Amino acid sequence: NVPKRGWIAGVGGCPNVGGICIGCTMPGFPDKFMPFMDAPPGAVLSSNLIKSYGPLIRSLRKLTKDTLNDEPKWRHNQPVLTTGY
Amino acid sequence: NVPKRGWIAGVGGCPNVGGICIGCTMPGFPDKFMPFMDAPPGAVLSSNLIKSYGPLIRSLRKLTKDTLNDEPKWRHNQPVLTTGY
Amino acid sequence: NVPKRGWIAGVGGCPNVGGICIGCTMPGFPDKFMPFMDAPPGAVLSSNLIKSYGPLIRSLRKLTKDTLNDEPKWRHNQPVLTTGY
Numbered sequence: 192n193v194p195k196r197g198w199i200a201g202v203g204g205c206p207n208v209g210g211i212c213i214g215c216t217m218p219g220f221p222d223k224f225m226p227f228m229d230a231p232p233g234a235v236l237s238s239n240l241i242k243s244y245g246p247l248i249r250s251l252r253k254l255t256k257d258t259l260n261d262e263p264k265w266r267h268n269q270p271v272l273t274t275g276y
Numbered sequence: 277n278v279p280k281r282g283w284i285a286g287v288g289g290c291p292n293v294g295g296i297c298i299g300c301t302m303p304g305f306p307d308k309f310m311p312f313m314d315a316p317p318g319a320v321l322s323s324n325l326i327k328s329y330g331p332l333i334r335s336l337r338k339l340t341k342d343t344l345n346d347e348p349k350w351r352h353n354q355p356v357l358t359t360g361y
Numbered sequence: 362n363v364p365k366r367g368w369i370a371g372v373g374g375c376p377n378v379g380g381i382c383i384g385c386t387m388p389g390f391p392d393k394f395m396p397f398m399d400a401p402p403g404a405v406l407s408s409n410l411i412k413s414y415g416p417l418i419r420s421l422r423k424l425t426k427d428t429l430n431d432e433p434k435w436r437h438n439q440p441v442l443t444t445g446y
């Protein structure tokens with residue numbers, strides 16, 4: 192739970208901070224994880240997994256974000272109130 | 277950056293601890309987000325495709341996990357060393 | 362070429378105006394097409410095709426459309442020209 196909780200005062204961690212998780216809390220440690228800097232064989236399948244939907248969902252998110260980066264029209268210094276009141 | 281950063285000394289935040297993010301930092305806040313306790317229109321979309329490969333990746337992870345939840349055979353109190361030394 | 366071409370002076374046609382195509386120009390007409398009001402067998406395939414990229418493509422389109430339904434900010438009757446001139 193290190194990443195979810197941090198190391199000390201929420202300050203540290205491993206992957207959430209740039210450190211590969213080497214499985215140091217598991218019965219299989221360390222032998223079933225070495226070499227540590229190699230990709231887990233199961234990960235290559237999931238990293239070579241194909242998300243054709245990967246670029247779409249990102250493009251849709253950006254659009255939605257852009258409209259959220261636009262204040263409503265009724266916020267101005269014009270002498271006539273547009274807020275609907 | 278609140279969830280990534282926490283609120284005070286990494287203690288709190290919003291979604292990371294069960295509070296929906298109401299986009300209080302966005303120029304569109306709050307009108308483009310209300311009503312807050314309703315699902316955002318574009319959410320259900322990305323949900324319905326990952327459901328085809330969720331239970332798969334989930335099982336594939338539960339299995340490797342179990343292998344990692346097993347100590348190497350050479351860890352015992354038998355009369356003879358079997359670690360490879 | 363009827364729907365692409367219209368029937369008379371580009372006015373009528375068949376499926377383009379709600380008339381099922383019954384293959385009346387084809388060497389197999391009418392036997393390989395009856396019963397007419399039944400769906401084509403091979404058609405049923407691409408019809409029920411589980412293209413779950415669909416609800417995501419219409420959304421990605423509606424979001425683009427909505428932005429194209431907003432005039433740029435510099436269109437207004439304020440005492441200050443703000444087009445970039």
Ligand code: SF4
Pocket residue numbers: 192193194204205206211212213214215216217
């Ligand atoms: S390397 Fe260890 S301390 Fe770090 S996240 Fe993994 S199991 Fe936890």
Ligand code: SF4
Pocket residue numbers: 277278279289290291296297298299300301302
């Ligand atoms: S509700 Fe606000 S403080 Fe919280 S994560 Fe969202 S933008 Fe940040």
Ligand code: SF4
Pocket residue numbers: 362363364374375376381382383384385386387
């Ligand atoms: S029913 Fe006949 S005229 Fe109409 S589109 Fe089909 S081939 Fe053309």
